[PDB]
Amino acid sequence: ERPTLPIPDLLTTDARNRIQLTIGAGQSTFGGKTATTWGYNGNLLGPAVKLQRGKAVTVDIYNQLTEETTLHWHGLEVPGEVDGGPQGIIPPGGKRSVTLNVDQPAATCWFHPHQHGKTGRQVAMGLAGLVVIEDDEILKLMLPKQWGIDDVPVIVQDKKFSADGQIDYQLDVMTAAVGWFGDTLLTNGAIYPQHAAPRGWLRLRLLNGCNARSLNFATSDNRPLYVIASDGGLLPEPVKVSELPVLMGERFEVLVEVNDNKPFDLVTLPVSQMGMAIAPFDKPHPVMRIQPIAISASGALPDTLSSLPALPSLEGLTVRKLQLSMDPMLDMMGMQMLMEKYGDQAMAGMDFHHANKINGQAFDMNKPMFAAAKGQYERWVISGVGDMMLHPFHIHGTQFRILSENGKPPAAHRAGWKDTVKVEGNVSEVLVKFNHDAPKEHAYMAHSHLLEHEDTGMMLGFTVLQGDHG
Ligand SMILES: [Cu+2]
Ligand SMILES: [Cu+2]
Ligand SMILES: [Cu+2]
């Protein structure tokens, strides 16, 4: 029998208004082999922290690893001091506390390490958790809302393991060039689980938690997915899709219909990204089995969900150009190693530690590239012209609107609030506004979310201090 889908615990504040997260090493089992893994409040992955718009929470973070880490709340708009970028060091055996004052629409965000140069390994070892933000608006909708029954998080990740069963992560030339990817797909940490869902509407909060692998969700029997929310919250109305591409670090919430006596699989379809259509990912691959059950369910697919504000006029806004690049030598060496090992299938459908760059500079923790304005829209133009690697570009401190995505206006289910934009051999443009401060000592990051590229230099720091005084 397939294992049941693990359900992260939904963790709320205690009487002291505190949430405790312990970062630690333990053991997990994959395919009958034990592996050392890391987790928040457990052996692997983490809980779902539940936050309400307009309410403060204090998080106490206990680092019980033997190495430094940081804790970043990806998708949360918070000041730099509590954003948990690479400057937010938590010593091994130490504790750090942050007060989060949540001020943004309901959405599914997530959290993960951001340790300088080591983010890929620390996520690969198992660290990731979820953030569920609620507000008044969303609860009035009739959405499926029973956590772990008809409202379920789905954190999808690949791993590769060595013969001893341990997770096999090394940041070497090939993995630095193409990304860390594996042959084993996990869904909330389990291999091909089943989830028992009541007849009616099932809400899936999908996260691509892979280091480097893009995904493309669909159902085994071609039933549609109704997209209701993206990274930064609800869309204005549901968007019906037959397939749903999801970049690394992106979330979408979808509703799917569950009918009596008709089990089906959520699957991922082959993608056109270097290295990612190697067997078993050359064909549709299962993510999990949905098994209909007969218990109570009241959830609805609402005709209307929210209102999206009009894009502001673009005239007169500051433009920032961010040119992404990879060292041609790393690109050539890594691509050759990939082709030699896997052959043509590795391109199907198509020293090095500071090799990857933005505007000619590898990330410098001591030197923010610029100071962005506070409380003012800017247009950021991000280019990957010059290579054909996938760069899901993420900017801390904001939920943004995509104006142009890699050659075209964004797809309808990508036109709302986003914290990731596709850049791949073309140029994208986003409209951003920073509402919180970030000083040089706790700067915001902007980077590709292909973690091995972030780790080898494709990140910049930026500060936010003041708006116009002119
Ligand atoms: Cu992230
Ligand atoms: Cu982030
Ligand atoms: Cu980041």
UniProtKB/Swiss-Prot annotation:
Keyword terms of this UniProt record: Copper, Metal-binding, Oxidoreductase, Periplasm, Repeat, Signal
Names of the cofactor(s): Cu cation
Any Gene Ontology CC annotation: periplasmic space
Catalytic reaction equation(s): 4 Cu(+) + O2 + 4 H(+) = 4 Cu(2+) + 2 H2O
Annotated positions binding Cu cation 4: 391, 448, 453
Induction comment: By CueR, in response to increasing copper concentrations.
EC code(s) of this entry: 1.16.3.4
Keyword Signal annotated: yes
Result of changing residue 387 to A: Decrease in oxidase activity with 2,6-DMP as substrate
Mechanisms controlling activity: Ferroxidase and phenoloxidase activities are enhanced considerably in the presence of excess copper ions. A labile regulatory copper ion near the T1 copper site is important for the copper associated activation of enzyme activity. Ag(+) acts as a potent inhibitor of oxidase activity by binding at Cu(+) binding sites, blocking Cu(+) substrate binding and oxidation. pPD oxidase activity is strongly inhibited by sodium azide, an inhibitor of the electron transfer.
Biotech exploitation of the protein: Triggering CueO activity at need by the addition of copper salts with minor toxic effects on E.coli cells could be used as a simple tool for biosynthetic purposes. The protein was also identified as robust host protein for use in biosensing and drug-screening applications.
Effect of deleting the gene: Disruption mutant is slightly more copper sensitive on complex medium than wild-type strain under aerobic conditions. Deletion of the gene does not affect copper sensitivity under anaerobic growth conditions. Deletion of the gene leads to elevated biosynthesis of enterobactin under conditions of iron scarcity when copper is present.
Residues the record lists as binding Cu cation 1: 72, 394
Record: residues binding Cu cation 3: 114, 396, 447
Single annotated GO MF: copper ion binding
Keyword Oxidoreductase set for record: yes
GO biological process, alphabetically ordered: detoxification of copper ion; response to copper ion
Effect caused by changing residue 389 to L: Strong decrease in oxidase activity with 2,6-DMP as substrate. Affects copper incorporation into the T1 copper site
Listed NCBIfam families: PRK10965.1
Primary role: Multicopper oxidase involved in copper homeostasis and copper tolerance under aerobic conditions. Is responsible for the oxidation of Cu(+) to the less harmful Cu(2+) in the periplasm, thereby preventing Cu(+) from entering the cytoplasm. Probably primarily functions as a cuprous oxidase in vivo. In vitro, in the presence of excess copper ions, exhibits ferroxidase and phenoloxidase activities. Fe(2+) is an excellent substrate in the presence of excess Cu(2+), but is inactive in the absence of Cu(2+). Oxidizes the phenolate iron siderophores enterobactin, 2,3-dihydroxybenzoate (2,3-DHB) and 3-hydroxyanthranilate (3-HAA). Oxidation and thus inactivation of enterobactin could protect cells from the interaction of enterobactin with copper and play a central role as an interface between copper detoxification and iron homeostasis.
Oligomeric form and interacting partners: Monomer.
Protein name, per record: Multicopper oxidase CueO
Originating species: Escherichia coli (strain K12)
Gene: cueO
